[PDB]
């Protein structure tokens, strides 16, 4: 995550194991209950995009959950690029590219550019575009995994 | 296991033959093109005659939320 | 590992028992199952080669698995000779000399010559190389090791 | 236990065999190339009759992954 | 151990209960299996022979092994003693006096000697000297140890 | 299971079928407005007749302790 160092700058931090296992440890035993949502929430808190797919790839179990989420992040991802077309001509040598879906997905992107978006002013909240499709796309499984 | 060897049993509900599916899927690294061909070839299938008789019913274009509730009942 | 310490330079740490442990526990637990890979590459983030030779050479159990690896860090290792040849003439006074497989896979290497490749200007990624080799042989482990 | 009481059973699969061969050799301290020299040889020598004349229609060269995968029906 | 402060210096810090405790569950877990040696190696990172023997009396069973050691340790220490004479003449005001097998076991140093001899320049590497002991005495008892 | 499909058993008290109603509600992400429509409608509709019969004796504007404590001794 990138969090804020005590000399008062934004800089990135690593997660932590038991920070880790608990994600795990909430899959393993509310698996597709709503609980997990906030649960999510909280532990998302100053995440990055690469520390969010850590999080989606190190799922083990519910395949079929887990596949429909990849496909909701993609369609989100589509409509992201589809609603934010690139912009007019070539990139300023004093200024940063704007992300696509797949930026903001992680995919396409590096830390250090995860981190120059957030850090930067103004800032663009990249996380928060991925929570959105995350929490969408568990309002998807939650409604179907509902029996 | 291979993913060929990826069966749906006779009383086994789809539901837990897409999740076996998707973690094999999971193992195999090919190009993403090749594994939606799979994805559409291969998990309908080795499916069941009484959900596959289902799913052909839902013609092409279909998404997996809708193939699941479609063979729920099965 | 090689972390940044507050005053804002690198300097190595030593990685935490309980850090071990949970290294122990996946392989325990998950045996050669994918999400030990996601795994791996969070617990090794900015980790050392001596340090991945410690997290290897820890293991117990699954020796088969073991040995078709290092044999693979080998293969990779001497294909790194392989493909960068040494360079021409004596060693500079102001430099410090290339790796070989070897001083990637840490053997050759001391873990001051460690942190004198990657904490100087330019850095070189020797932990990144190793990793890749790590997760190729990884590959090789899983693609067995399915039934 | 001693590296050359180290052998396969009947009905043990090879595999199983590998994995006490490389915890055994794990507990010899010797020079790497004797070690080389009781991999090529003791492993092969002490594999059971079904798995031995799989392991020699391998040829020389082979690598443990082919040797792991050869091995696995008997 | 002696580990690194903040402020740039080498000061001595006590070895931590989940560490010591951790080293006692390794012995009581894996006995004499091979991956104590690494472990032993881990948990080894900057201690003093103080702490050394602190571990090695801290242990509860295995006493035919721990006597083995025991006797191992000392000749070692004879032959450190052996090898390296004592220098000529009467010790320097303004020098520190050189090691024998039994400070290197600890026995004959104090740790403010122990911390002298590891943080002045040249530094003495006493633990390195006592480590090899310890894991060649490892090897003694594995190898007899071996069913 | 859809919000239609939770109703009070015949022997279940109300008190453990308002937890499945509000746990369930709890899965519904609809607008407050229809929430409130759902609350006051569906609740006492699959209600059982004992508790039901109470519960229109409690008339409108009723509140959740009082039906709570309105339905205990059925």
């Not at chain 1, 690469?50 to 496909?71: C, F, I, P, R, S």
């Not at chain 1, 250090?112 to 957030?118: L, P, R, V």
């Not at chain 2, 190009?31 to 839902?58: R, Y």
Request: glycine share 6%; aromatic share 6%; hydrophobic share 40%.
């Amino acid at each position: 995550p990138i969090v804020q160092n005590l000399q008062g700058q934004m800089v990135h931090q690593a997660i932590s194991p038991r920070t880790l296992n608990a994600w795990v440890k909430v899959v393993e035993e509310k698996a597709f209950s709503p609980e997990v949502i906030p649960m999510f929430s909280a532990l998302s808190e100053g995440a990055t995009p690469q520390d969010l797919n850590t999080m989606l790839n190190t799922v083990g179990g519910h395949q079929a959950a887990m596949q429909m989420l990849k496909e909701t992040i993609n369609e989100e991802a589509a409509e992201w690029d589809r609603l934010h077309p690139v912009h007019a001509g070539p990139i300023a040598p004093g200024q940063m590219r704007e992300p696509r879906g797949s930026d903001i997905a992680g995919t396409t992107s590096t830390l250090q550019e995860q981190i120059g978006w957030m850090t930067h002013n103004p800032p663009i909240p990249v996380g928060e575009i991925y929570k959105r499709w995350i929490i969408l796309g568990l309002n998807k499984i939650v409604r179907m995994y509902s029996p | 296991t291979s993913i060929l060897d990826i069966r749906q049993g006779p009383k086994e509900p789809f539901r837990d033959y897409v999740d076996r599916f998707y973690k094999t899927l999971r193992a195999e690294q090919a190009s993403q093109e090749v594994k939606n061909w799979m994805t559409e070839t291969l998990l309908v299938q080795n499916a069941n005659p009484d959900c596959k008789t289902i799913l052909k019913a839902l013609g092409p274009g279909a998404t997996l939320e809708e193939m699941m509730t479609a063979c729920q009942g099965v």
